[PDB]
């Protein structure tokens, strides 16, 4: 459950370590982003000579949340952090690897490249 001011871990090798959400791209006035939703964020922490650098305003999709997400089969899943993957305007990952599990919900939302790259899909 992500909103502006929320810090996200970035789960790729774009060079970003930590991004802070500044807007959730979902209608006129959405309050929260969950898995599969796209946010606009600021790169608050990066590592030297990456693609992205601190201060960059980037787009990203949420792949993990500490707030458990509920599923039609009556089950839920919850992660230890809130994590995102930095993308381009074509919803494609800018990196070449994604680290850690991702929510299966990404699949139904057309983020196949990230799902494929993900080491595990839960």
């Amino acid at each position: 459950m992500i909103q502006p001011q929320t810090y996200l871990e970035v789960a790729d090798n774009t060079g970003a370590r930590k991004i802070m959400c500044i807007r959730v791209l979902k209608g006129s006035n959405a309050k929260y982003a969950t898995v599969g939703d796209v946010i606009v964020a600021s790169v608050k922490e990066a590592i030297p000579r990456g693609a992205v650098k601190e201060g960059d305003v980037v787009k990203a999709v949420v792949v993990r949340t500490k707030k458990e997400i509920k599923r039609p089969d009556g089950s839920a899943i919850r992660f230890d952090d809130n994590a995102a993957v930095i993308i381009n305007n074509q919803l494609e990952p800018r990196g070449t690897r994604v680290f850690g599990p991702v929510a299966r919900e990404l699949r139904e939302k057309g983020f196949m490249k990230i799902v494929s790259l993900a080491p595990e899909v839960l």
Partner: protein, 131 residues
């Protein structure tokens, strides 16, 4: 009129009786029916059960696993039809009903805190010897 009975009656067609008993602290492997398009397959989720919240047909249990460097928790309905089976992989000895506290512990610390439940382990091997 017995309102409680009516509900139990509605629920009865959906009740399961084929799953093994397990406690918070046990290490369990839940084989879950997962859909990915357009075929469905069985995905295994294995971790410590940190919570069981009982409510008859509506009890649910929560299993916790560390997956590729990230902690993952999964809530399952105890009578969900998407559970193929559940395999007790290990009996764990807890001293409380909810084990949320293990979220802040190292792998070493969890291990010392959840000693193997030797009594129920023996009980497991004591059965499984059948006619």
């Amino acid at each position: 009129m017995n309102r409680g009975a009516l509900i139990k009656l509605v629920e009865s067609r959906y009740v399961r009786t084929d799953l093994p008993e397990f406690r918070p602290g046990d290490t369990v492997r839940v084989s879950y029916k997962v859909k990915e398009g357009n075929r469905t397959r069985i995905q295994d989720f294995e971790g410590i059960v940190i919570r069981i919240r009982r409510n008859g047909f509506n009890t649910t249990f929560t299993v916790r696993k560390v997956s590729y460097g990230v902690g993952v928790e999964r809530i399952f309905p105890l009578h969900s039809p998407l559970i193929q089976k559940i395999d007790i992989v290990q009996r764990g000895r807890a001293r409380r009903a909810k084990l949320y506290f293990i979220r802040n512990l190292s792998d070493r610390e969890i291990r010392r805190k959840l000693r193997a439940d030797r009594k129920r382990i023996d009980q497991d091997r004591a059965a499984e010897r059948a006619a």
